[PDB]
């Protein structure tokens, strides 16, 4: 059991439910709720999120460590030193080499492959939920929207659509099915991540109308402009990105096929330095 008896956790600073840097057998991350009276809906949220994390043990899933109920509802996970992929790419504009970018793609795919293999759909994959831990290891986090595929189609009930729009698949936005999420919707989000990785920018930078993007993407009018990929982007990546981004969800590859591709993408790829010449001993 993973319940942490009350008193042991020592909440500290804040970062962004709500997330604090705390203390429990070393630095940890604490994501407890600030609602004194947890509604039974916030309760099932918590129960579900814990339920999912419990099933994860993989170097690219951010490490769930335990949960607390007593003071407030909270989830404890490993602490990360270093920034999110969002932060590297759009804030400090880290100048990663293409081999590194490919590798970040590869690890992110590795973590997703592992989740889907245990039937977990993340539902909120983005560039802010992908952490470059110690600058070397991709840890996928925030499982607040994560869910496990039910064998029955009569247990989906109802859920108000939430999430970041830039990573939402057209079918998710449209929200026409009982359950529009699928492994494939996660792939699409990963598709947008490839976009950030191969271009350095978020999609739809000319459009700042939030409702317009939701409407135009859901309708099929709007889709990422793949021409904005930087010139050092391997052709195989551009293709792989366009495939993850297909509007018809079933046309998207799944993560083994994604790892099967990216697995050979960096396998038969050329990461050289051109200049070479003769460096001083």
């Amino acid at each position: 059991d993973w319940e942490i008896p009350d008193g042991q956790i020592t909440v500290g600073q804040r970062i962004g439910g709500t997330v604090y840097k705390g203390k429990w057998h070393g630095d940890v991350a604490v994501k407890m709720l600030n609602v004194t009276a947890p509604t039974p809906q916030q309760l099932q949220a918590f129960k579900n999120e814990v339920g999912v994390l419990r099933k994860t043990r993989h170097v690219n899933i951010l490490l769930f460590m335990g949960y607390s109920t007593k003071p407030q509802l909270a989830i404890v996970t490993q602490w990360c030193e270093g920034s999110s992929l969002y932060h590297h790419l759009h804030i400090i504009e880290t100048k990663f080499e293409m081999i590194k970018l490919i590798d970040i793609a590869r690890q992110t795919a590795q973590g997703m492959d592992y989740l889907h293999a245990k039937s977990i759909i993340h539902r909120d994959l983005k560039s802010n939920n992908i952490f470059l831990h110690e600058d070397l290891t991709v840890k996928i986090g925030d499982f607040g929207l994560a869910t496990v595929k039910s064998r029955w189609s009569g247990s989906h009930q109802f859920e108000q659509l939430s999430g970041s729009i830039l990573w939402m698949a057209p079918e998710v936005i449209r929200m026409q099915d009982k359950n529009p999420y699928s492994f494939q919707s996660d792939v699409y989000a990963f598709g947008i991540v490839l976009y950030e990785l191969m271009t350095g920018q978020l999609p739809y930078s000319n459009i700042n109308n939030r409702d317009q993007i939701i409407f135009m993407v859901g309708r099929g009018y709007l889709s990422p402009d793949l021409s904005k990929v930087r010139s050092n982007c391997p052709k195989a990546m551009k293709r792989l990105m366009a495939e993850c981004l297909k509007k018809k969800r079933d046309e998207r590859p799944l993560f083994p096929q994604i790892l099967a591709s990216i697995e050979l993408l960096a396998r038969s790829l050329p990461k050289i330095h051109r200049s070479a010449s003769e460096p001083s001993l």
Binding site: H273, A276, S277, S280
Partner: protein
């Protein structure tokens, strides 16, 4: 005092002040006596660092000059600065090259020293070529080719295929082919055969230059893979 001038040179080097470093070793070389080989290496490091700072600035600004296809004003500004950087870069290359013609090549008494200074002469003419336009350029390219070639001939005859210096010469001479003479196949076969010849004689590696030889072999093969792209 050659030993003072040399001790300051290493002080300059630790302080990352390569123009001071290069000034010390210059005046050493000028004392007209054969450089030791700790000395020779100090001179080569200094000027490689001093010239490399200009080469890298040249490339940045030359690039800006091409990405500003009028944009005439920006392009004029970029051109001017390029040419100011060039003239620093030519002074540096001429400085080195006159040291080579006047002291180091004439005083070179052992085969390894001649290959080292003739390669260096290939190198500095190549840096002048990177940057020459028009009338100058063929002469400058010929001189680079001729120094490398002489060096290459002596090193094939006198040195082991895994010698760092022979490997480095093959590396640089192959770079000259690819980058200055736009002959990639010639560049590829020069680098391939220098690599294969060193693999054939790994017994010739010694404890104290093992590391450099090994690194240059890797650099040979990396250029090849780049050039076959």
């Amino acid at each position: 005092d050659k030993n003072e001038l040399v001790q300051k040179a290493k002080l300059a080097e630790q302080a990352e002040r390569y123009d001071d470093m290069a000034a010390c070793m210059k005046s050493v070389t000028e004392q007209g006596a054969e450089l030791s080989n700790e000395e020779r290496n100090l001179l080569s490091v200094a000027y490689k660092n001093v010239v490399g700072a200009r080469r890298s600035s040249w490339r940045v600004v030359s690039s800006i000059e091409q990405k500003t296809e009028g944009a005439e004003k920006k392009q004029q500004m970029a051109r001017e600065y390029r040419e100011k950087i060039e003239t620093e870069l030519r002074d540096i290359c001429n400085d080195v090259l006159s040291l080579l013609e006047k002291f180091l090549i004439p005083n070179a008494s052992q085969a390894e020293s001649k290959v080292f200074y003739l390669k260096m002469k290939g190198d500095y003419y190549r840096y002048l070529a990177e940057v020459a336009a028009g009338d100058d350029k063929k002469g400058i390219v010929d001189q680079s080719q001729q120094a490398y070639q002489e060096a290459f001939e002596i090193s094939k005859k006198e040195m082991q295929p895994t010698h760092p210096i022979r490997l480095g010469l093959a590396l640089n001479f192959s770079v000259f082919y690819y980058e200055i003479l736009n002959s990639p196949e010639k560049a590829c076969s020069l680098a391939k055969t220098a690599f294969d010849e060193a693999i054939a004689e790994l017994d010739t590696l010694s404890e104290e230059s093992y590391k450099d030889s090994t690194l240059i072999m890797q650099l040979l093969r990396d250029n090849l893979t780049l050039w076959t792209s």
